[PDB]
């Protein structure tokens, strides 16, 4: 109901103290800003008394009474966190005391390698450290984040942890949610380390999933672990009902940086899962923002932040501020956020533990784009700088990559001739040329070349082999691949555009290198067969990999040169892609080579990438 809200004396004092000592940025944080109103607070500085304070605020023309209410909310909301701070640090403290007395005894709670695991395989010392950490943090009934760097064995650590549970009499169904390209590997590992666990790969089309559902609800077989993907756990309301009405103890989520968004439908759909505990595995917990890490923390420890989410998102919604534009209280909240996550998040770094792994290098190759590409780039830049038309950035990087990503060598004249001439084909005898020209307008030069190769009547209009290999990136890439082939190397080549990978296929065919290729179009079932085919057959030289799919969680210990034909605006996609090969078991010094176009937007993206990387390097230490 609506009633007269009486200002309590304690809240009166808190509001008065805050208004007396808040900074200009802090005064801005109060709702109903009207920044002249916040400025008048400094002028209205007698702070005579609370009633005198109200007197000054009302007498200053251009103010409102609701401001006192607004700050009343703010402090209260801040107070909401403060008690949580008090709850959080003790949660840390209650933890950080018990972690100490174990060192007192000669032998403490060193949870050794479980007898269930494969005796012929052994945990590495840091993996044992992580296993002990997970076991003890479970023993206090908390949820953590295993933020070990890419390649340290987080999957093995989780499997050994589940095996330890199974040893302690906990055989409850425990889930695992994995990326699509990784699921096969998971089913492979859970056996090779822990064959005692009964594993259900709940994946496939709706028919196969419904069959699996009918079998399990028949209680046909008892299962300890159910492995699924991110979509198959959410796609149908039947799946959501299945996972809600089951009783699950552990919900492990590989690559938790997919839950970075708090508003993405997968996020709240995944909180709908019934589970006593959850665990997040990620190599990059903080990507570009503190609110992202806050969303992860809300996911992992929901109940203690469940009702207070609105406070957290708003106070962390200051993404637009710079390092110095951050208010003093914002820096304090960042530091105390690091102090809030310090019991939940564990991180280990390969260069600090894995001394036997050879180090990593880099080669930023500046690529001088050829005369034709330079003319095209300058012309398109002049056309766009004048000005809908999101083309400001994307279709500038497209000319950065390859001229064939747009349509320049197929003028409308050639398109009209082809449209009228393809009436001679049987499949398009009834076709309308006036609409064939419309369709061919929006098709790029490489797509038109593929079309010309496809139909017999228009085989005249192929591009010459020199034109399709006219690029600075291609020119440097040919020399690099020849050099590495002579050196007896194997190359993992990345690109963010599918059409770029298609052109790379043609280029490799021209240089007659054997290659494999994986992108999002490849069916989920044979991605593992492709990966094994590359890891075993040593005659395959190049492995084309799209960054989104071929970058997430696969093992590429076979190769030792990772080329990025194009780098990302977000550097962590690149970091995952580079550390695909640089992981446990690698035996060569993994080189990483980035291709960069001279004098383009590519240099600006590289600079911004370096700035973000340095921001992470500062915040992590």
């Amino acid at each position: 109901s609506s009633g007269e809200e009486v200002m309590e004396d304690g809240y009166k004092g808190k509001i008065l103290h805050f208004l007396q000592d808040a900074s200009i940025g802090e005064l801005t944080l109060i709702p109903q800003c009207s920044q002249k109103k916040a400025q008048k607070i400094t002028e209205l500085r007698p702070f005579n008394s609370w009633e005198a304070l109200f007197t000054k605020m009302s007498k200053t023309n251009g103010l409102s009474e609701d401001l006192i209410w607004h700050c009343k909310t703010l402090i209260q909301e801040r107070d909401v966190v403060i008690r949580l701070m008090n709850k959080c640090e003790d949660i840390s403290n209650k933890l950080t005391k018990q972690v100490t007395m174990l060192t007192g005894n000669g032998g403490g709670w060193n949870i050794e390698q479980p007898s269930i695991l494969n005796q012929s395989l052994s945990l590495k010392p840091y993996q044992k450290v992580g296993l002990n950490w997970l076991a003890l943090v479970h023993k206090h009934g908390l949820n953590g984040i295993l933020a070990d760097e890419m390649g340290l064995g987080k999957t093995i650590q989780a499997i050994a942890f589940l095996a330890y549970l199974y040893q302690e009499g906990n055989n409850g169904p425990h889930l695992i949610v994995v990326p699509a390209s990784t699921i096969d590997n998971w089913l492979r590992e859970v056996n090779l380390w822990c064959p005692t666990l009964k594993v259900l790969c709940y994946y496939g089309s709706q028919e196969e999933r419904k069959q699996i559902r009918f079998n399990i609800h028949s209680r046909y077989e008892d299962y300890n672990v159910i492995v699924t993907t991110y979509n198959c756990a959410i796609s149908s309301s039947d799946d959501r009902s299945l996972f809600r009405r089951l009783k699950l103890n552990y919900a492990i989520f590989d690559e938790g940086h997919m839950l970075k968004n708090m508003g993405s439908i997968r996020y709240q759909h995944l909180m709908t899962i019934n589970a006593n505990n959850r665990l997040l595995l990620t190599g990059t917990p903080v990507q570009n923002n503190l609110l992202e890490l806050m969303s992860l923390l809300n996911f992992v420890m929901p109940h203690m932040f469940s009702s207070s989410t609105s406070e957290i998102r708003r106070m962390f919604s200051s993404k637009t501020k710079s390092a110095d534009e951050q208010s003093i209280y914002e820096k304090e909240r960042i530091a105390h956020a690091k102090q809030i996550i310090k019991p939940f998040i564990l991180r280990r770094v390969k260069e600090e533990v894995l001394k036997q792994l050879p180090p990593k290098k880099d080669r930023i190759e500046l690529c001088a784009m050829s005369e034709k590409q330079e003319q095209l780039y300058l012309g398109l830049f002049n056309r766009l700088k004048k000005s809908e038309m999101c083309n400001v950035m994307m279709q500038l990087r497209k000319m950065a990559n390859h001229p064939l990503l747009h349509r320049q060598y197929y003028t409308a004249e050639k398109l009209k001739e082809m449209s009228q001439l393809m009436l001679k084909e049987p499949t398009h005898c009834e076709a309308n040329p006036d609409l064939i020209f419309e369709d061919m307008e929006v098709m790029t030069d490489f797509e038109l070349h593929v079309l010309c190769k496809q139909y017999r009547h228009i085989n005249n209009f192929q591009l010459d082999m020199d034109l399709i290999l006219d690029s600075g990136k291609f020119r440097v890439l040919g020399c690099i691949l020849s050099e590495l082939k002579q050196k007896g190397d194997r190359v993992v080549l990345f690109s963010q555009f599918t059409m770029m990978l298609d052109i790379l296929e043609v280029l490799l065919k021209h240089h007659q290198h054997r290659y494999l290729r994986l992108d999002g179009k490849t069916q989920i079932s044979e991605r593992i067969h492709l990966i094994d085919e590359f890891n075993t057959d040593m005659d395959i030289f190049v492995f084309l990999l799209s960054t989104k799919a071929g970058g997430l969680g696969i093992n590429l210990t076979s190769a030792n040169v990772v080329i990025l034909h194009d780098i990302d605006c977000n550097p962590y996609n690149d970091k995952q892609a580079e550390d695909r090969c640089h992981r446990v078991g690698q035996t060569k010094e993994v080189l990483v080579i980035k291709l960069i176009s001279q004098g383009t937007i590519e240099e600006s993206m590289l600079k911004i990438n370096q700035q973000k990387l340095k921001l992470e390097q500062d915040m992590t230490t």
Binding site: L95, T96, V99, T100, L102, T103, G107, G108, W109, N110, V129, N132, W133, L136, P343, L346, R348
Partner: peptide, 9 residues
């Protein structure tokens, strides 16, 4: 500080 005590067992 727990990572420190983990090796300190």
């Amino acid at each position: 500080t727990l990572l420190k005590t983990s090796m300190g067992l």
